Amino acid sequence: DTLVVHTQLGTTAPGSPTYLAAVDRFREENPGVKIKNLVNGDDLAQVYETSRLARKEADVVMVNLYDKTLAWTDVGATVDVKPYLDDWGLRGRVLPAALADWTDDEGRVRAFPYFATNWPVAYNRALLDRAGVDAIPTTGDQLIAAARKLRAKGIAPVTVGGNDWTGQKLLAQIIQTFLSQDEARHVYSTGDFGVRGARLGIEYFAHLRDAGVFADKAQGLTSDSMTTQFNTEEAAVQSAMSSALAKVPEKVAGHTEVGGWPLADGAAHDGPTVIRAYTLIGFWISPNGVRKIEQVEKFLRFMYRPDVVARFVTESGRDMALRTDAVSTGFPLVGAAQRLGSEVSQVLLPDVYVPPAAAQPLITATSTSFTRGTSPARVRAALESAYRSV
Amino acid sequence: PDTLVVHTQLGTTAPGSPTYLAAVDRFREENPGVKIKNLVNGDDLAQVYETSRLARKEADVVMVNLYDKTLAWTDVGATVDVKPYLDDWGLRGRVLPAALADWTDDEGRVRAFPYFATNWPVAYNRALLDRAGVDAIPTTGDQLIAAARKLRAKGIAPVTVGGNDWTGQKLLAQIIQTFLSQDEARHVYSTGDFGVRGARLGIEYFAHLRDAGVFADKAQGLTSDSMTTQFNTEEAAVQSAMSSALAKVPEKVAGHTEVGGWPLADGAAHDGPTVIRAYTLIGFWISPNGVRKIEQVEKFLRFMYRPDVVARFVTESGRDMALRTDAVSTGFPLVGAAQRLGSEVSQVLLPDVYVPPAAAQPLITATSTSFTRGTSPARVRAALESAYRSV
Amino acid sequence: DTLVVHTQLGTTAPGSPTYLAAVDRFREENPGVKIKNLVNGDDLAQVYETSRLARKEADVVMVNLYDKTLAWTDVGATVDVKPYLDDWGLRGRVLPAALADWTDDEGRVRAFPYFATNWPVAYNRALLDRAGVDAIPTTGDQLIAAARKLRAKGIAPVTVGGNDWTGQKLLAQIIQTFLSQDEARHVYSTGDFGVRGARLGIEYFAHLRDAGVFADKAQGLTSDSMTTQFNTEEAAVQSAMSSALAKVPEKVAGHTEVGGWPLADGAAHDGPTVIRAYTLIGFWISPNGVRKIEQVEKFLRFMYRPDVVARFVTESGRDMALRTDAVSTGFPLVGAAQRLGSEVSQVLLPDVYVPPAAAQPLITATSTSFTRGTSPARVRAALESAYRSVE
Amino acid sequence: DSDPDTLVVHTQLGTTAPGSPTYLAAVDRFREENPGVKIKNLVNGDDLAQVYETSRLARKEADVVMVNLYDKTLAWTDVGATVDVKPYLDDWGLRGRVLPAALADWTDDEGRVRAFPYFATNWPVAYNRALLDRAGVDAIPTTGDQLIAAARKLRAKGIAPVTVGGNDWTGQKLLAQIIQTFLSQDEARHVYSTGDFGVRGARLGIEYFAHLRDAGVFADKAQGLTSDSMTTQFNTEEAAVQSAMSSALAKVPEKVAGHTEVGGWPLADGAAHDGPTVIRAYTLIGFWISPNGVRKIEQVEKFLRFMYRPDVVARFVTESGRDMALRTDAVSTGFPLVGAAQRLGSEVSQVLLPDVYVPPAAAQPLITATSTSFTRGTSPARVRAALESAYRSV
Structure with a gap:
């Protein structure tokens, strides 16, 4: 019953140092909470799908929106987060355009937006x-x-x-x-x-x-x-x-x-x-995640905190899909x-x-x-x- | 459901599609009661297939080549080991030795039934x-x-x-x-x-x-x-x-x-x-769903492996084959x-x-x-x- | 590469026209594989046994189950075809009652059923x-x-x-x-x-x-x-x-x-x-036919194709021992x-x-x-x- | 006072009251965490309840109050000088972080929770x-x-x-x-x-x-x-x-x-x-929410989730030697x-x-x-x- 996160951050992916610091911060703040990370790169969606069919999938996933993950929501490999976005009261933390780009043709919100890019x-x-x-x-x-x-x-x-x-x-x-x-x-x-x-x-x-x-x-x-x-x-x-x-x-x-x-x-x-x-890296929630939803909400509310978000901006010079006053x-x-x-x-x-x-x-x-x-x-x-x- | 579903790259633009369609129609004439359907997809077949697998509705047989996306199919079980079928059905031997080897992974599992090849x-x-x-x-x-x-x-x-x-x-x-x-x-x-x-x-x-x-x-x-x-x-x-x-x-x-x-x-x-x-171009893969319709898969794959069917692809479409044939384009x-x-x-x-x-x-x-x-x-x-x- | 078939079909016997079209088509589907028919009627059993003595017996026999052929399996004049029926996936093509009528009491299937009769x-x-x-x-x-x-x-x-x-x-x-x-x-x-x-x-x-x-x-x-x-x-x-x-x-x-x-x-x-x-005309395999069961495999799979079976029913007015949807x-x-x-x-x-x-x-x-x-x-x-x- | 993004807290902590040192550090830590949120403390001792009521009647009372449960504050819930906090202990899953006995003792006859429990005493x-x-x-x-x-x-x-x-x-x-x-x-x-x-x-x-x-x-x-x-x-x-x-x-x-x-x-x-x-x-010092505070319930959300966070609780226990009304693994x-x-x-x-x-x-x-x-x-x-x-x- 430890919170397991399947993410692309942790090694060479941009924003990795700050993400690891966040995970260690998260533990200091919640001594009893057990959190574990599973790192994968370009093949994360493939690895996630295999564990999903085996019903041994991670609770939270951190990957961007592209070809393969664009289909998760409809097949139900990943759940629609809008309900949680509303209940937890984090909807207002997301830039309006960012939230739109992450919503279905139907009304579903594929994932909790996080990373972005200025070009x-x-x-x-x-x-x-x-x-x-x-x-x-x-x-x-x-x-x-x-x-x-x-x-x-x-x-x-x-x-x-x-x-x-x-x-x-x-x-x-x-x-x-x-x-x-x-x-x-x-x-x-x-x-x-x-x-x-x-x-x-x-x-x-x-x-x-x-x-x-x-x-x-x-x-x-x-x-x-x-x-x-x-x-x-x-x-x-x-x-x-x-x-x-x-x-x-x-x-x-x-x-x-x-x-x-x-x-x-x-x-x-x-x-x-x-x-x-x-639409760069965002937080997806899996079926296993829902059965562990209180532990998931803890982690996500933490990741959405201005405190934590400003760190990504400030320390790793990251552009974000959330509202913040921090500047790189x-x-x-x-x-x-x-x-x-x-x-x-x-x-x-x-x-x-x-x-x-x-x-x-x-x-x-x-x-x-x-x-x-x-x-x-x-x-x-x-x-x-x-x-x-x- | 009781109808063989084939997820294939052939059917429209892919080379050999015309003959494949004749083969399918020919297969239906040889087996009056058999139901067979085709799902066509080009370079995105692997992705469409993995998605149908999440929905637990994946096609019974797959016709795609061996490249980076399908290379990981056999080890995670998105597709099964075809060796026991190749043997039991007495089809090994219809395959060129060098082709069967190239289609067998490190654990000795045969990824799929070889079919197309290429002279370059x-x-x-x-x-x-x-x-x-x-x-x-x-x-x-x-x-x-x-x-x-x-x-x-x-x-x-x-x-x-x-x-x-x-x-x-x-x-x-x-x-x-x-x-x-x-x-x-x-x-x-x-x-x-x-x-x-x-x-x-x-x-x-x-x-x-x-x-x-x-x-x-x-x-x-x-x-x-x-x-x-x-x-x-x-x-x-x-x-x-x-x-x-x-x-x-x-x-x-x-x-x-x-x-x-x-x-x-x-x-x-x-x-x-x-x-x-x-x-390692297009070959026939068997999905977990396909194993539940194995006798149906069997009738279709041995028809496809028949000398006269293979010869048509060579003779009529000008394809190179991973199987033994006396035909020449x-x-x-x-x-x-x-x-x-x-x-x-x-x-x-x-x-x-x-x-x-x-x-x-x-x-x-x-x-x-x-x-x-x-x-x-x-x-x-x-x-x-x-x-x-x-x- | 040469299948020798000792048959009662080929001349005056019913179903001969369709058998000959079948043979000609089989070749058409298998160039390189020769088929040689040896025709005999009623006296086929005797001619066959003389062939055995000469140790140059035919590979496949097509004959009736009657007094003379009923002793064949036990002396090994013809082999048990059960292991070939199962493993060739042809078992299910046989009408249950027909398979039973063609099985002796040792559990040996004398031949592959084919012809039958409604009287x-x-x-x-x-x-x-x-x-x-x-x-x-x-x-x-x-x-x-x-x-x-x-x-x-x-x-x-x-x-x-x-x-x-x-x-x-x-x-x-x-x-x-x-x-x-x-x-x-x-x-x-x-x-x-x-x-x-x-x-x-x-x-x-x-x-x-x-x-x-x-x-x-x-x-x-x-x-x-x-x-x-x-x-x-x-x-x-x-x-x-x-x-x-x-x-x-x-x-x-x-x-x-x-x-x-x-x-x-x-x-x-x-x-x-x-x-x-x-128990009318069926396919028997001799010891010579086993030492080249590869060519025998193709022939019986071809003859058992719903495709071919229907031609016999529809084209010659033949009653069959195998399952069909065709009616003459x-x-x-x-x-x-x-x-x-x-x-x-x-x-x-x-x-x-x-x-x-x-x-x-x-x-x-x-x-x-x-x-x-x-x-x-x-x-x-x-x-x-x-x-x-x-006695 | 007044503007949103400005949480005003009327507290008995801040000077001589026990736990004051650790409360101040928690406030400054909270600030470091939420740069866009101003926090103001109004400190009072035995007369906080009186001062708060005078502010409530003038419609300018603090958003959050930090007082214990005694005669005077025992009357705040029924007259509405302070709102029912149970709806809040329930959303944002904070109940469960509270010792069963503590939550019970802070609940009145109508099943209303007077305040968020926090301080306790082992005697x-x-x-x-x-x-x-x-x-x-x-x-x-x-x-x-x-x-x-x-x-x-x-x-x-x-x-x-x-x-x-x-x-x-x-x-x-x-x-x-x-x-x-x-x-x-x-x-x-x-x-x-x-x-x-x-x-x-x-x-x-x-x-x-x-x-x-x-x-x-x-x-x-x-x-x-x-x-x-x-x-x-x-x-x-x-x-x-x-x-x-x-x-x-x-x-x-x-x-x-x-x-x-x-x-x-x-x-x-x-x-x-x-x-x-x-x-x-x-029933020593607890967190109360005023109608004004309800208006700024989003800010109050941040403050309470913070104070109830395990690491913050452990500091009160470890650095101040306070017995708490919430579940902890920390020991003084x-x-x-x-x-x-x-x-x-x-x-x-x-x-x-x-x-x-x-x-x-x-x-x-x-x-x-x-x-x-x-x-x-x-x-x-x-x-x-x-x-x-x-x-x-x-």
Whole structure:
């Protein structure tokens, strides 16, 4: 009757140190409580399902929302937490958008939201100064002339991993310039880049690209090339997860500012965009958990405490799906992105909606798209073909 | 319920679907009272199946290949050991020995009934070679380079390949295995240790061929599509490809096209040009639910294992089989030719089942970087190895 | 790779057309596996035994279960097929009663059942209507009343070959009116027609005979005059194998119905009765056939496919020993007989139980019994004297 | 005051009251835990109840009150100056964290829970071994006969036996405990509420008491002693036995405490307890919620879940040496006799603390009647008459 938690945190996963400290804190606070952790990585859902069929499954699970766990709630492998969210009175602790993203098409709340991600654009002021620029929120001369001026001084503009996930996400964000979230969800879950908003998004991307906004040979770059270029100051801009901006050398981060991606005239947003997801690790409750619900509520109420939540923000520079006044003012760029607010508009992280079979092909088509000169028609063709399977 | 449910990847677009549907309809004519239903799913079958298993409504029989997601099925019991059925039904023996071995895990359990396989040879367009002045198919590296330079001299691309997707990915692994026995290869692609003498010897060989212009210009950016378009429109003279892709080579082109293996470097760990081969594509799995309808499963699997049914897949769809057959895909020239290839070519490993799921995508990325002309063997080795850092 | 089959099918035997299509299809489904048929009729057993002496016996035999083949299993001329029935998963294809009839007392299954026979009674309703008989008789008295009315109109009543096997079997069937299958097995094994059931049936027979239920001078008729009399509508009733009913002219079959033989009070059956056996042509495996049971496996699985079985029923008008849903509607009377079921009781086909030395004398004694006026005592005497040459 | 995110607590803790040091630390810890919640403390002693009522009538009373259960606060629940807390003990599963007896004693006739229990008192009997050894008594007395025998032996070496302030609250509580040798919880409830010392149980107990006293079980002149006399006599080791609140036992000089053992009061034949008996009360400072507090019930939620958290409870026990009304595994180790009293189990029977049930009008006269009763030779009839006369107001 010890509380057993099947979680992805405990070793190499981000936020692990603070989670272990929380578990040890939890024990000091509740001397008699027995809590045990079962750590698994990418194969946690598979391991959880096997123990579930054997009726030996953990009481609480900590994993993100993706392909496999997106089906748990309907098959009943995991229970709808809304009842507990209400009874315990923790509903109000969750950001409104976060709670929505974690709710069924039906009314069910898949899990207790916890982790999230801020994915803004970092601008190197010193580098923009060396040229003749200032931050930029506009498509034209602003993003493009800034790029022309940076290049004029032998400095790469925006660096991005054209041949991997970082590129796949930037392409999607830019295309989203003319797509509101509801629309992007359709585009990316079906693979219909033939919609007006998407065609305008693709054209926009194609225009910036052909003007030299991205580093030379971006189509062949990766997350490594990207972060190395920005960290050594060979490029002036980079759209990256706050978690990645967390490792920008102190020196470089001192004269670095975070914002959104420059808007094009006629955009479906009122401010430079940034990517935002609230579906990273969350707390799920299992059938075994319900039979041990009082012990579960103890643990979750503790994890939802501002006290505990601020620690994840403060000590591990984590973005959260819960309401808190804490800021990662220890991971400067991270803290700065959390302070953004309303001068930037939110766009989707395609991950959850993109069918798994279209994932790798979507990256190969992105790499084809970042190729200087590739017509919008071919861009749309490559992208859509990434969905052949389906 | 009393009706066999088959969860399969065949039925619509998957290769062999047309024949599978005939087989099913044929099965129904041979057994007037039997009820059989099909549940179709592509790359997401494994996921849809595991979910039906949670609902306790999983299909009785499963038709999917062996890859990272299904590799863990037998040990956790999501799917049962098929050995006692293969034996009791007297079907072992219909299976190619090398196929049965590849489908048996470490504990000696047979994961599933083997069915589909793959010949993955090198196609050489003879008219393009003759046009350029290469009068024979190259069997050594130097001959390959010489032919490559000659081809380029006539404005013809030598070897086409999707340097930025799965095709270039396996070709790189294949060329590297020029100096790796299959055992050594399993170890390399399993552990991500490209430091072993054979792997460096292969990486070096690959870099030499590449820097010599053996692959089409800008190959690091091509895809399976660009590759097959280039070979089919006769813009490139050589192409390594699955039997399935070769089955689609336009008639006129297939006419003056012959198959062989990849040219060997001196000191090679094989006796002749290499070709890829696997026996782990689609096979028949039995779920716990299936065991409750075992006599129904039995009637369906022995029908599927019948010589004349297997021959139809070979003869009519042009598939390669994991089972013993006298059939040859004569109706798909290059495929039939790849099936007749004997000891004049050596088989190398298709890395897929040994590669950790986390190193897969990165490995594709590291491949593109590697096809780029001038990338030192040291850097190729580093990119390949970094693909395994997330495992 | 060559299966030799010693068969009674292939030329004039019923079901030959379908057997040959089956063989041709089997090849079609199994190229490389040759099938060689050795055809023989009635004298197959002897020719087979000579083959055994030469030590070049056929692998599979297709023959009837009668005196000569009944000794085969015990001397090992043919092997027990039970271990092949179970383990090949064919057991369930066999009608329970049929499997039992093919099992000796050591529990050995002599052969794989295949052919069978429904032997009912055909009633010409047109002739019945011509006379004043409105309904098919169900009791001895109704039968006699119907025979009287038929004769008043000049129409012969029950035609039968009183001097051959047809008369032989109908007389055994009439007597069994008061005998259970087991009691009848003892009677025809022993030659003991003194049991209460045998004498009660013999008198019932005498009564019907003395009242004119049979055509005039029936004691000297044969299967020939019998079927000729019915096909030309000179006689209105005929008890006969389904195989002979399929030969009835369409115009006549058009107003013909099948049922059983009218019961006498105190009968030992729910009746009317019909003869039914499951021991006609079956598949036997010889010692040579076991040393290559691989090719035998395919052949019997093929022959036992509902698929093939239906062709025999539907295409040749064959009654089968295996379960089927098919009915020979192209041979109406056969189809009708196959559809009888409940309202008819099945009696014994004596043949297998009759010692060979009593076979012919039993026919002779049958002609005597069909002579009007021959007392029950004399009918019993002749019947029992048929067994004087046996132990 | 007033704004949400501002919890105002009217407490008797904060300065001289026992547990104040640990309460302050808990408040500051709570603040560290909830940065966005301001906490204000209004401290008052004996007049908190009066001050709270004046605030309640002006519609600006604190959100949470921390007071014990006595005459005045005993009237808050029915008139609504304070809300029923049972609905709350029930949600957020806090009941179960409360000792069954504690929760019962804090529940009125209507099944309403006046407050969240928190502080309690263990009131056992301490026996000085060093002195029992000098006298020749090698075992702590368990029965009235043995107690008397130990008293004799003790006096023979010139050592006073049981010391107690017969002219103040100590004497009045010990007399009531001894009389309770023959009274169940409910019976003692009736006896001290109505002043009816005629019930057979009180009559028997008064005999027992008179027997012990006449036998010289108490120090000479106990009738005129006080809590100070008592505390002094035991600390300088002039007397070997002393019944007293664990809070007083916590101040026993460590040298003396080293060889001191705690138990219960010896039983007479046919007592109403498996005994020996020790006094236990669970109605010292508790948490009350005001209507204003109900408005800020979300803030009150945080505060109460905190105070009821095991680690916070254990600090009160460990760092302050407080007996609690909630379940704990902690023991007042740093205050030896307190920890030993807490570790006492079934080998000691609980009797009641009269305080809550004695009409205030009888409180002072009951002490004066108690002094009279401790005077040797005073008939059981006179003891009973003096006790009953203490209730002349009713």
